C-alpha cells in the first residue's frame, strides 16, 4: 500500500482534446484530463469511467489504456499510480459544474503552461498514440524534481 490507484482520461478526437479546469482542491487552478481515486470494489477502467461522468458529464464507450504514471509528492507518504486512459468515443456534451469546467482545445493550442507541469513531457506522446511510463518527483505542485519517461508497447 505505498500508492494509492488513480485514474486520468484524455478525451482525444482527431482535431481537439477535452481538458478540464478544476476549481477548488488538489489541482486547482489548471488544466487537466479528468479523473480521481479509484473506489473499493472498482476497477480501474470502471473508476475511469466514473471519473469521467462526474468531472465532465460524458459517459464513454471504449476506453483505450495510454499509460501509466507515479507521482511523488515530498513531505507526503502516499504515492498516487495514476492509470492513464484515452476515448475518442463519447456521449453527451461537456458539462461545468462547481468543481470542474471543461473546454475543448485544438491541437496547437494545448494550454501546457497552464496545465501540471508533467503533462509537458507526455502529452506529445499521447497525441502521437504512444503508451507509456512514467514517475515524477514533485515540490510542491509546480517543480519537478527528477523524473522518468519511456514508451512502451504493453502499458
Ligand atoms: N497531470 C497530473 N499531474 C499530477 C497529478 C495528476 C493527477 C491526476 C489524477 C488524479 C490525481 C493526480 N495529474
Known amino acids: 500500500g505505498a500508492s494509492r490507484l488513480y485514474t486520468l482520461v484524455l478525451v482525444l478526437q482527431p482535431q481537439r482534446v477535452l481538458l478540464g479546469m478544476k476549481k477548488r482542491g488538489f489541482g486547482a487552478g489548471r488544466w487537466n484530463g479528468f479523473g480521481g481515486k479509484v473506489q473499493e470494489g ?6 475511469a469511467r466514473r471519473e469521467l ?12 489504456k495510454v499509460g501509466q504514471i507515479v507521482f ?3 513531505g507526503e507518504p502516499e504515492l498516487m499510480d495514476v492509470h492513464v486512459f ?3 468515443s463519447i456521449q453527451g456534451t461537456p ?3 462547481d468543481e470542474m469546467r471543461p473546454c475543448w ?4 493550442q494545448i494550454p501546457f503552461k497552464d ?3 508533467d503533462n509537458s513531457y507526455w502529452f506529445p506522446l499521447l497525441l502521437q498514440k504512444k503508451k507509456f511510463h512514467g514517475y515524477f518527483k514533485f515540490q510542491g505542485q509546480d517543480t519537478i524534481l527528477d523524473y522518468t519517461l519511456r ?3 504493453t502499458v
Do not use: K, R
Open 53 to 64: 461522468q462526474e468531472e465532465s458529464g460524458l459517459t464513454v464507450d471504449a476506453l483505450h
Open 115 to 117: 496545465m501540471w507541469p
Open 42 to 47: 472498482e476497477t480501474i477502467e470502471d473508476g
Open 95 to 97: 458539462v461545468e459544474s
Open 151 to 153: 514508451e512502451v508497447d
Open 72 to 74: 511523488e509528492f515530498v
Open 86 to 88: 484515452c476515448t475518442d
Open 105 to 108: 482545445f485544438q491541437l496547437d
